[PDB]
Design a protein around this ligand. Structure first.
Ligand SMILES: CC(=O)N[C@@H]1[C@@H](O[C@@H]2O[C@H](CO)[C@H](O)[C@H](O)[C@H]2O)[C@@H](O)[C@@H](CO)O[C@@H]1O
Length: 602
């Protein structure tokens, strides 16, 4: 029988007998020297969580796990595939560091229960080259700790691509640097994680619309209608300053992400009925592309100019598909632009038509979305329907195509205060295994979804997934102090740090890894409801915290306890800002710094 591993092996030639892992076992690297494979192999020893260790100075022998990097196997194993033999040693042979790494992901699952594995062999090569999760970390901020956990689980399931839409805190354009954002050091930590776990990051700055996270303080870059009224999320692609601004931000972002791909988004610029309100678009289209040109030609030209820009720096461009609707009769989309297909309908170009242009096409179906406060993909029905990347929105291919790159699930924060990142982490568990399985492309693991879920939950998270303590305080009543000031209810539902206050708080852990923080004196819960909102979330740095009637559904009343130096800081689950004493008046406000609080039972 094939081993019960996920994703499944493309095949399995079973024999009788078993391999048994002992304490004296070596991990032996006896192919080409590769410092990345070696570093991976040292981490792998720890992930196995027994006493096996990397050997040096000897040949492979019975009992070893052998990791053999042989570039001459590329024609059989590709860039990511490996050969696995389980006999009286385990041998993983691959052409690349990544193929060895994926072989080790299988070995972890084979040996988890009792250190024994059934004998046999497999050539295990992925069916698709892009096997993805996408996270829109926009408006809100999604913690780097959450991303590290996701990437470990992705790697454990041989997923290899992480799309991230996020805003780098900008030195190029400081007027865009309003929360949420990632600092450049934080982005570099994500880059390092992805290198460790053999994931390719694919960053996006959406354009030329959906730019309200950049253009808020740039009224001069916002598109204006016939009457001068601004469309705040949109650049005016008829003007030279649009491209100049956009490529300046791309260039800054590529310096930190250092990715091979750039995703510019390029969703539909506006509905067709809106073009008459911006007659500069048709005018510029005609000016540049002739009497027959339409605004869609201008839009596609904008994309092709970004293409030229990023190609000059050795990168490749990707876009969404929904602005490709057969209306750009003069200016075709450059055929080396990867199209990620998520939406069908109307005259939106079909996947078959895109693939016939010879360009790369990824399946990013709507049906594989997770949305805060909204749509949840139907993992069970998809599994039962034997979903593959051939199953696009609006069109099933019956024949494969080499330029179909693969597929990804996508995690969106539309109602950003409706669900916490920890809730989303729970929700994505089975989606992740589903997409890993469908894109790696081996035999279906179980005829039933129940069997697949059971297996996936038995295998569980990657080794060492946990990277935080979610419950560092016993539930109870505490004074929360900084010097001789204690957090307390103050005027007008406010909360301040108050000298010699006796005020105390009931802290109670929640199911999703946070705490509610409830006034002993008032009975009201610590909340974030004041200041500017984006997607319903209180994202204003400097906004006052306040007290409100305790509500289980108010995710803004959930607080993460970040610990350090015998103290804690309180991070709002939704805003991801920390409780901070405001110097002028002692008010508790939310900032990207923090006030350290000592918890004293009380
Ligand atoms: C064009 C469109 O409707 N796209 C939808 C997604 O839009 C993204 O929304 C996020 C905010 O959550 C951000 O503004 C991105 O730039 C934007 O592309 C998104 O709403 C998803 C999920 O509902 O649906 C469409 O893909």
């Amino acid at each position: 029988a094939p081993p019960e591993v996920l994703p499944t092996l493309r095949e399995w030639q079973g024999g009788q007998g078993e391999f048994t892992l002992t304490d004296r076992a070596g991990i032996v690297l006896d192919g080409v020297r590769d410092s990345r494979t070696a570093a991976d192999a040292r981490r792998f020893a720890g992930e196995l969580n027994g006493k096996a260790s990397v050997s040096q100075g000897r040949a492979a022998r019975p009992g070893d796990i052998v990791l053999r990097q042989d570039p001459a196997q590329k024609g059989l194993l590709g860039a990511e595939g490996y050969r696995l033999t389980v006999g009286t040693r385990i041998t993983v042979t691959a052409a690349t560091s990544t193929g060895v790494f994926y072989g080790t992901r299988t070995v972890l699952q084979l040996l988890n229960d009792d250190g024994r594995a059934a004998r046999g062999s497999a050539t295990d090569v992925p069916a698709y080259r892009e096997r993805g999760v996408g996270v829109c970390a926009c408006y809100i901020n999604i913690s780097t700790q959450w991303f590290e956990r996701l990437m470990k689980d992705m790697a454990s399931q041989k997923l290899n691509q992480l799309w991230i839409e996020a805003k780098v805190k900008s030195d190029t354009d400081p007027a865009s640097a309003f929360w949420g954002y990632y600092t450049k050091p934080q982005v570099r930590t994500l880059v390092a994680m992805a290198r460790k776990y053999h994931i390719e990051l694919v960053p996006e700055i959406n354009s030329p619309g959906h730019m309200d996270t950049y253009l808020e303080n740039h009224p001069e870059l916002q598109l204006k209608d016939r009457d001068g009224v601004a469309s705040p999320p949109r650049l005016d692609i008829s003007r030279p300053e649009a491209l100049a601004y956009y490529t300046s931000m791309v260039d800054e972002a590529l310096k930190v992400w250092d990715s091979r791909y750039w995703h510019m988004g390029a969703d539909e610029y506006m509905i067709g009925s809106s073009y008459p309100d911006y007659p500069q678009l048709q005018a510029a289209a005609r000016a540049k592309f002739g009497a027959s040109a339409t605004p869609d030609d201008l839009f596609t030209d904008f994309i092709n100019q970004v293409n030229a820009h990023v190609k000059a720096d050795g990168r490749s461009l990707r876009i969404w598909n929904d602005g490709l609707a057969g209306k750009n009769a003069v200016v075709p989309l450059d055929r080396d632009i990867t199209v990620e297909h998520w939406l069908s309908g109307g005259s939106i170009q079909q996947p078959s038509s895109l693939l016939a242009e010879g360009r790369p096409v990824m399946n990013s179906a709507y049906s594989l979305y997770l949305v805060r406060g909204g749509f949840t993909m139907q993992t069970q029905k998809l599994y039962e329907s034997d979903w593959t990347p051939l199953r696009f929105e609006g069109q099933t291919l019956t024949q494969g195509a080499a330029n179909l790159t693969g597929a990804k699930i996508s995690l969106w924060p539309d109602s950003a205060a409706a669900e916490t990142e920890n809730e989303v982490e729970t929700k994505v568990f089975m989606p992740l295994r589903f997409v890993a399985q469908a894109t790696w492309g081996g035999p279906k693991p179980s005829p039933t979804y129940a069997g697949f879920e059971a297996l996936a939950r038995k295998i569980g998270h990657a080794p060492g997934w946990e990277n935080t303590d979610r419950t560092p305080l016993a539930d109870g009543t505490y004074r929360l102090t900084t010097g001789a000031k204690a957090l307390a209810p103050t005027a007008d539902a406010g909360v301040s740090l108050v000298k010699n206050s006796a005020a105390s708080w009931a802290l109670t852990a929640t199911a999703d890894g946070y705490y509610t923080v409830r006034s002993t004196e008032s009975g009201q819960c610590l909340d974030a409801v004041r200041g500017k909102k984006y997607l319903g979330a209180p994202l204003e740095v400097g906004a006052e915290l306040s007290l409100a009637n305790c509500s289980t559904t108010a995710r803004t009343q959930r607080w993460q306890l970040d610990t350090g130096a015998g103290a804690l800081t309180l991070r709002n689950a939704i805003s991801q800002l920390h409780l901070t004493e405001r110097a002028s008046d002692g008010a508790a406000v939310q900032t990207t710094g923090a006030t350290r609080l000592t918890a004293r039972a009380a």
